[PDB]
From Swiss-Prot, chain A:
A GO-annotated cellular component: bacterial microcompartment
Subunit and interaction comment: Homotrimerizes to form a pseudohexamer. These stack, with the concave faces together, in purified bacterial microcompartments (BMC).
InterPro entries given in the database record: BMC_CP, BMC_dom, CcmK-like_sf
UniProt protein name: Bacterial microcompartment protein trimer-2
Disrupted gene: phenotype observed: Not required for efficient BMC formation; when deleted from an artificial operon (Hoch_5815, Hoch_5812, Hoch_3341, Hoch_5816, Hoch_4425, Hoch_4426, Hoch_5814) being expressed in E.coli, normal BMC shells form.
Free-text comment on this protein's domains from its UniProt entry: These proteins have 2 BMC domains which evolve independently of each other, giving the term pseudohexamer to the trimerized subunit. Although the homotrimer fills the approximate space of a BMC hexamer protein, the BMC-T trimers are more compact. Their universal presence in BMCs indicates their structural importance. The homohexamers form pores at least 5 Angstroms in diameter; in the stacked homohexamer 1 pore is open and the other is closed. In the BMC the inner pore is fully or partially closed while the outer pore is closed.
Function: A minor component of the bacterial microcompartment (BMC) shell. Expression of 5 proteins in E.coli (BMC-H (Hoch_5815), BMC-P (Hoch_5814), and 3 BMC-T (Hoch_5812, Hoch_5816, Hoch_3341)) forms 40 nm artificial BMCs with a molecular mass of 6.5 MDa. One of 2 stacked pseudohexamers in the BMC. There are 20 BMC-T pseudohexamers per BMC, composed of mixed BMC-T1, BMC-T2 and BMC-T3. The shell facets are 20-30 Angstroms thick, with 1 of the stacked BMC-T trimers protruding to the exterior.
Similarity field: Belongs to the EutL/PduB family.
Keyword line: Bacterial microcompartment
Swiss-Prot record, chains B, H, I, J, K:
Signal sequence residues: none
Organism this protein belongs to: Haliangium ochraceum (strain DSM 14365 / JCM 11303 / SMP-2)
Annotated keywords: Bacterial microcompartment
Subcellular location per the Swiss-Prot or TrEMBL entry: Bacterial microcompartment
Name of this protein: Bacterial microcompartment protein homohexamer
PANTHER family with a match to the protein in the record: BACTERIAL MICROCOMPARTMENT SHELL PROTEIN PDUJ, PROPANEDIOL UTILIZATION PROTEIN PDUA
Swiss-Prot record, chains C, D, E, F, G:
Protein known as: Bacterial microcompartment protein trimer-2
SMART domains assigned to the protein according to its UniProt record, in alphabetical order: BMC (SM00877)
Keywords annotated in UniProt: Bacterial microcompartment
Family, per entry: Belongs to the EutL/PduB family.
Quaternary context: Homotrimerizes to form a pseudohexamer. These stack, with the concave faces together, in purified bacterial microcompartments (BMC).
Chief site of localization: other
Length: 201, 92, 202, 202, 202, 202, 202, 92, 92, 92, 92
């Protein structure tokens, strides 16, 4: 059951840096074309990874067999190689581009002027950049989970924010973005437009 | 009943430093202070026997640095006639 | 969606110590009032936390984004600040006291005279005080998970027990309590009376 | 609520080694008879553990209280002692042998000649033995989770493979096996025949 | 070079619980005679462990192979078996009883009525029981680090305390104890009278 | 023996955020006056911490008893309260202001246009903000280790850089700063001019 | 100061797998020429890494700035690229080939027929392949710590053993190998012939 | 159960003055006395450890005035096998 | 059957501290105490020879701090006539 | 199973005095005796390891005075294949 | 079939220590023992060739401590006529 299929054209610097900090695999560098596949059940993603690696010469970074599901990331400098790996992944699953689920948006909010007491909690439980007291915050949950990296890529692509934390796998993909208020507002507009501009089921 | 702990310092400054250090170093209750004149004031804490033994020896050790400690004593069980005739904060 | 809203009058010593051991935030001290809010979905708890911290001067300890849910603890020495924070929390969600889910008691057992082979497993996978071999054990699961801290507060308040483990977040909130037999029996009676005295939506 | 009850007559060496590596409890050695009970809710497995330890002299290795469920392992050198512990476990739950859920086989695939880029990810994310590049991989998911130890036990018993990983607790029990092609094929045949030979509630 | 050879003739309950919570190998149950060996260098402890296991029936729990201090714990019900394992360990090391170092009480402190702000740091960085605010705290550093378990054993054997933490390894041996005032004073007196009454060569 | 005694009169925000991320205790907020005390030997810092907490209103975050040293951090909004805590700590240690070791800048090295192959190893072994590929890196080690937070405080106070990782405890105090070229040059100049201008005993 | 400079001309599969499991960087695959550099002091290895990455096409996996030492592992398919990175690292350090310390085997023990109680402690404290009970064990320590990977590489290159654990960094370089008796004898002979046939400063 | 304290005086007179001062100085229970023959008698008090450490240290000084104190010792936690086989007042 | 262990202390105080340190250090059975008059009492533990050899080395070590130990001895196998004629607790 | 104690004396007189002193000085069980010919006989006691370490050191001390002791050795845990192959009295 | 390992000790006690150390240090089978008179008993282990070479040199080193080792030999392939006539525990 295909839950998420998104093709990132080029990884932004903070997104590639966060993926290389938090992944378990061949870590990406900024500027590479990426791909994210999340299927159900969680162990057939090994077969998906093997199909992609037998077809193309992409390198995988995130391949996490989760509680119920499984997310795969593959990447290469060539968009043609990454799209060929994606076509092989879709041909192995016997589905197409529209077999994925359309990402629901559970909660999107912009928190103005986050106090110090909340920032200490938020970036004790983060893995990327630190949010400072007084800076704004954008939160975002997407079901299925694999679209939060799409939101992070298209949010950093159109603004100047801090990727605090993104959880690309699990029940709900989450997203923490920090920065000034106009930049958080533009990043929130870009991220919501990028999530709502994806077809699915 | 509750055990008795007393510090007597010639001077009000040396008594308050004793009365501050006794209630910080144990679970004791500073009930008051007695002014017997002549510069002698006496702090009284009053809890159980294990805490007032560690409060006053942390009260005496803290009050010798600032003043002149006259007497330090710990009564583990004061008699019920002691508490009923003398002002020690547990008067029935 | 409000799942848990419980107000604690005062944190007991072992409960405040366990929360300061296992919390991610500003640790509580004993004697402070408390407030546990668990909502869904688990990222709006940041908006709830921001509302509470803009309103009052309370200090937060536990704010854990779970797999599907989100928990919040705030605390302060004065009870009025914590109650005003809770009123601001309920106004941000536009719900009331009774909008919370009524907690089910899905397991309550008193396992008496626990052998060494079981105690070593139990307090290999706990954080609080260590259950000894031969002592008793009270277990509890409450759904939603945010009422296990209420059970731990009102169970330590009425007995002399060891808080072996409490887990206020997840699909089921768990509670481990050790001690002598009659004191575990009294704490079990107090905790079962405390969870069943919570109004809410079934 | 019973979900899994499987009696293992003898732990194979790699399975006993993996359980002693990744268990929180008294470590099993090879040659011992094992027993795996997984019930719901997650905290009544403490009562099941106590019942087994008061009845027999068996010794527990895995007693994991999961999010929604709870797993139990007990073991001893004597199959009669382990089966008496199992009889007391089934008498405490007041259920029978067939009260367990019949395990679904939700995915079984033999991935032959696994590339290096996949093996590095797999045995970065495993605890047991390591898969090398070029070796075949057998993967398996069973629902409920407690039958993956039966799958691993019989698959090592009828072949010569490497137990890369097995996760006997959770929503889905997983199994990773590495080795040569014919031996992965024989282990796959043995595991797929050993899971489907389990009676119980569909 | 033999540093620490101590024979714990009876594991007290909180000490056995702490060893089972922080153990690597086959964790013990209380009432067992234990035996701690720490040598220099720290790679010879595998041959020592193998000699003890081929000789006797003992079961090892703590066997740490760190920088040049090799710690080994073995235990069994039978004190004869534990002394036989210790004799085989001393024969395989080719040393004697008195080749161990005499233990050295370095720093013994009793901190009366510890505030809450310090207890959160103390038992956020502990493994055993929790120190509650207001309770007295006894800390202890011994040299070599392997005698801290004897100190914890006799300190629990005398007075009713809480074993907060004890570090049997490293360059120095920690011991954190918590309770009331007179009980911590009696435990500190017994631990000091048990450490420095041990024969050895400084 | 007192090694480090530095008084951070105002915590800058990224330094306060990093201390709250990596501290075991009561987290500081930006604007508070902080203090750092590092002593040798180690476990006397418990009595030092208790003396400071009984004297003043301060509220500690980093109190790490270490393999050979011991570090303490206390902080409060009132700079007079923090300085009175420092005077109490100096009086308990029976030393003065100037008894601290004068810090020594060992290795200041500016690495420019750090390639993406290296940034992942830099930040995977860090806790604070991530270094982006192409940004300059400043590394710094001071002896004693406790002055690295002074270097981080003054480097954030002058220039506009990202704090990657500062390690105030150990044999030497690391400091990783990221940012653009002129800003790393200004922050390095401020850190150099702030460390070597501290009066002490060499 | 150059401690360890060894050029692994081909990574064997289990060594490449262990490095990919325990590396904080970009993972290697079998067949690549590796290169290990260990220096003193510990933080110059960042400038060394920068120089190597700006010079050549190599890709780093292990780069650990430890308590006192610093390690670096670069690797690429082209052995000329890896030797050019080695020449760049030597020219940045301003040392030569023979400035490395000559590695000395400190301990070479074979612990044939390891009983299960020792196996569980060995493989709970390892990352590589599991050791099965009854199999032989080869422990090894080399000084400096970086030559243990050369020992593991040549030992897998000659014989057919299981790699259990190797420690490339620290004061001592450990190596645990498991297999049958003749295979462990062959791997021990090959690793001993690998270590002491390396020139350098004694 | 409770903490165990003992004063052994060679002579019945110094034992009772030890026993009279122990029950007055702290809240202990004089459970009895054990004649071992040859002029030795042992007064046994039994309360918590904060009181019996303060009772027997005050009961010794009252018995060093009139008698001949042989041994003073306080056991804070006597084992449950001691309380069943020896007469210390807590035999089940 | 069981091995025999004995501590003899001139005084009831040093016997109970001997009897406390024996039953805490091993899995023995304190069967009683023998009063041979003149100020002598004899604590008798009786278990297996693994335990009573290590119990009485703890009973000797603790009673020498608090009294005058007369004799410490362990019999690994007492004869069948000794237990049937002397009061050692295992008389059939 | 149980531990294994052995005294080998060149001579039947020195074996029986070795065998009699082992079963008196500890709680062991003399399962038999092995006649390997040429003057060598071996007394085999077999109990727990705390007794067979005390018995065979008392069997040797009594046999060196009357005979010629060849070998004394105590096996604390003999392997299960040794008791299945060699006649030690615990053959299943 | 399987390889053949032998320890010959002048004395029964040094053989059992040899026979115990061989089955612990490898996966071998102690098939029996041969009493050829004069006090020459001989332990025979029999397993695969890499293990019996490690069993005997762990048994030779262990039997020289307590006995008189006469001969040690390991046969990698004993011929099928040897196993049919001589009693090596694999008689067809």
């Amino acid at each position: 059951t295909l839950r998420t299929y998104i093709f990132l054209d080029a990884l932004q610097p903070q997104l590639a840096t966060f993926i290389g900090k938090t992944a378990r695999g061949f870590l990406p560098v900024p500027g590479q074309a990426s791909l994210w596949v999340e299927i159900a059940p969680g162990i057939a993603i090994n077969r998906v990874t093997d199909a992609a690696l037998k077809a193309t010469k992409v390198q995988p970074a995130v391949q996490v067999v989760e509680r119920a599901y499984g997310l795969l990331e593959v990447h290469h400098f060539d968009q043609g190689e990454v799209l060929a790996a994606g076509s092989t992944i879709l041909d192995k699953l016997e589905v197409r581009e529209e077999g994925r689920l359309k990402p629901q948006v559970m909660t999107h909010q912009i928190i103005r002027a986050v106090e110090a007491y909340q920032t200490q909690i938020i970036n004790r439980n983060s893995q990327g950049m630190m949010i400072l007291p007084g800076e704004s915050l954008f939160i975002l949950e997407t079901q299925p989970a694999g679209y939060a990296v799409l939101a992070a890529n298209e949010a950093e692509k159109a603004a100047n924010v801090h990727l605090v934390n993104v959880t690309p796998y699990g029940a709900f993909g989450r997203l923490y973005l920090a920065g000034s208020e106009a930049e958080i507002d533009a990043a929130a507009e870009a991220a919501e437009a990028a999530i709502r501009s994806v077809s699915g089921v | 009943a509750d055990a008795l702990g007393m510090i007597e310092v010639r001077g009000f400054v040396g008594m308050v430093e004793a009365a501050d250090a006794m209630v910080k170093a144990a679970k004791v209750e500073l009930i008051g202070y007695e002014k017997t004149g002549g510069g002698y004031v006496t702090a009284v804490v009053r809890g159980d026997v294990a805490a007032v033994k560690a409060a006053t020896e942390a009260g005496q050790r803290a009050a010798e640095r600032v003043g002149e400690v006259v007497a330090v004593h710990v009564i583990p069980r004061p008699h019920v006639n002691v508490d009923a005739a003398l002002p020690l904060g547990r008067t029935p």
